Write an enzyme that holds these catalytic residues in place. Structure first.
Site, mmCIF file in Angstrom:
data_model
loop_
_atom_site.group_PDB
_atom_site.id
_atom_site.type_symbol
_atom_site.label_atom_id
_atom_site.label_comp_id
_atom_site.label_asym_id
_atom_site.label_seq_id
_atom_site.Cartn_x
_atom_site.Cartn_y
_atom_site.Cartn_z
ATOM 1 N N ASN A 38 0.842 -1.197 0.000
ATOM 2 C CA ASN A 38 0.000 0.000 0.000
ATOM 3 C C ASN A 38 0.883 1.255 0.000
ATOM 4 O O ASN A 38 1.779 1.354 0.819
ATOM 5 C CB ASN A 38 -0.849 0.007 1.287
ATOM 6 C CG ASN A 38 -1.883 1.059 1.280
ATOM 7 O OD1 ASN A 38 -2.434 1.389 0.232
ATOM 8 N ND2 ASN A 38 -2.252 1.558 2.474
ATOM 9 N N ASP A 103 5.538 -4.992 2.630
ATOM 10 C CA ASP A 103 4.289 -4.426 3.161
ATOM 11 C C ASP A 103 3.125 -5.422 2.993
ATOM 12 O O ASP A 103 3.276 -6.585 3.337
ATOM 13 C CB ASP A 103 4.029 -3.039 2.597
ATOM 14 C CG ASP A 103 2.811 -2.409 3.204
ATOM 15 O OD1 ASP A 103 2.837 -2.159 4.456
ATOM 16 O OD2 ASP A 103 1.810 -2.178 2.468
ATOM 17 N N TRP A 104 1.981 -5.023 2.449
ATOM 18 C CA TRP A 104 0.865 -5.972 2.294
ATOM 19 C C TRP A 104 1.198 -7.082 1.309
ATOM 20 O O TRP A 104 0.648 -8.163 1.415
ATOM 21 C CB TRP A 104 -0.443 -5.233 1.960
ATOM 22 C CG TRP A 104 -1.012 -4.636 3.195
ATOM 23 C CD1 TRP A 104 -0.959 -3.344 3.592
ATOM 24 C CD2 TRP A 104 -1.643 -5.356 4.239
ATOM 25 N NE1 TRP A 104 -1.555 -3.205 4.828
ATOM 26 C CE2 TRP A 104 -1.979 -4.438 5.245
ATOM 27 C CE3 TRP A 104 -1.971 -6.702 4.422
ATOM 28 C CZ2 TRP A 104 -2.621 -4.831 6.427
ATOM 29 C CZ3 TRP A 104 -2.577 -7.094 5.606
ATOM 30 C CH2 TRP A 104 -2.899 -6.174 6.589
ATOM 31 N N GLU A 127 10.815 -4.511 4.926
ATOM 32 C CA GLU A 127 9.725 -3.666 5.458
ATOM 33 C C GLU A 127 8.402 -4.427 5.403
ATOM 34 O O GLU A 127 7.395 -3.970 4.851
ATOM 35 C CB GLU A 127 9.712 -2.299 4.755
ATOM 36 C CG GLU A 127 10.792 -1.387 5.318
ATOM 37 C CD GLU A 127 10.414 -0.835 6.684
ATOM 38 O OE1 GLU A 127 9.239 -0.425 6.879
ATOM 39 O OE2 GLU A 127 11.295 -0.825 7.587
ATOM 40 N N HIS A 269 10.344 3.335 4.588
ATOM 41 C CA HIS A 269 9.481 2.195 4.287
ATOM 42 C C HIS A 269 9.620 1.679 2.864
ATOM 43 O O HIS A 269 9.749 0.464 2.665
ATOM 44 C CB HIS A 269 7.990 2.487 4.582
ATOM 45 C CG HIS A 269 7.074 1.320 4.336
ATOM 46 N ND1 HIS A 269 7.103 0.157 5.082
ATOM 47 C CD2 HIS A 269 6.099 1.154 3.402
ATOM 48 C CE1 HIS A 269 6.170 -0.668 4.607
ATOM 49 N NE2 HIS A 269 5.553 -0.086 3.588
#
Length: 292
Positions: A38, A103-104, A127, A269
């Site tokens: 995201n 991330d996702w 991350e 990130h």
């Protein structure tokens, strides 16, 4: 750092909707599957893929509701993403794969690996999502922001009505300044405010302070799997990082089996935007020994 996206579009129809993906490289080996999070897309991997494509097929989907993929009116829960990505993987006919995840895309990748361990030959990650058991364990600079995102009123105002995830969080989580050309690539899927639903649902699904319980349990399950799995792992980290600060990366080097860590230098990130060439070259160098 390159700003172009020189990849021909590919599409597959899954669960009533078209998903877009990058597909480059040879077809006769183990493909490398790149999973964004995201509020990004396959564009995030644009400067990393060229390091890997010479030796391995690279497949980089845009998650449902994102990138150049269709944008059905879904809730865009994690479970929706799971259904669409599971179907995507089968539709392109992948059998064994190497994952490259963030991330996702890392929650999706680790959850798929836990369920299909025999099919995963390596995991490169950065991350990534693990449980954040209390708000104190979320980065202080981002605490107010994400607490506000995780509301039905203010969070929808900020993310959907005002585009805060694209205009705010994304550039704030790259050390170097994103250019306007790069920002326009990231803005393009979300030009229509109503299409920003996934950008709001995602922070509401993050496993923070025990909520939501289904995600916390799922993420605990894949992290238990990851801690006990002998699969080769490659973990990139930056300073100061966001989800995985330097001291936590060092802990993971010790507490994950067969794990190599790579310091990318400055990063928050979206590490891919700060040092894509080291991320790509290190993934490329690490792939051959996974074959046997």
């Amino acid at each position: 750092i390159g700003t172009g996206f020189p990849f021909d579009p590919h599409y597959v129809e899954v669960l009533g909707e078209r998903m877009h993906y990058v597909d480059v490289g040879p077809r006769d080996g183990t493909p490398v599957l790149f999973l964004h999070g995201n509020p990004t897309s396959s564009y995030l991997w644009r400067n990393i893929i060229p390091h890997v494509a010479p030796s391995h097929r690279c497949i980089a989907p845009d998650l449902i509701g994102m990138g150049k993929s269709d944008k059905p009116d879904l809730d865009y829960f994690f479970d929706d993403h799971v259904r669409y990505l599971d179907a995507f993987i089968e539709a392109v006919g992948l059998e064994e794969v190497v994952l490259v995840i963030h991330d996702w895309g890392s929650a999706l990748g680790f959850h798929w690996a836990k369920r299909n361990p025999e099919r995963v030959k390596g995991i490169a990650c950065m991350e990534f999502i693990r449980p954040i058991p209390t708000w104190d364990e979320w980065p202080e600079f981002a605490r107010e922001t994400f607490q506000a995102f995780r509301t039905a009123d203010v969070g929808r105002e900020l993310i959907i009505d005002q585009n805060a995830f694209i205009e705010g969080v994304l550039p704030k989580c790259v050390v170097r300044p994103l250019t306007e050309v790069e920002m326009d690539h990231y803005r393009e899927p979300f030009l229509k405010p109503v299409d920003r639903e996934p950008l709001w649902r995602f922070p509401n699904e993050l496993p923070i302070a025990g909520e939501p319980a289904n995600i916390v349990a799922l993420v605990e399950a894949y992290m238990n799997w990851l801690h006990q799995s002998p699969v080769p792992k490659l973990l990139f980290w930056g300073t100061p990082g966001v989800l995985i600060p330097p001291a936590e990366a060092a802990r993971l080097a010790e507490s994950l089996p067969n794990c190599k860590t790579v310091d990318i230098g400055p990063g928050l990130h979206y590490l891919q935007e700060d040092n894509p060439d080291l991320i790509g070259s290190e993934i490329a160098r690490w792939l051959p020994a996974l074959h046997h």
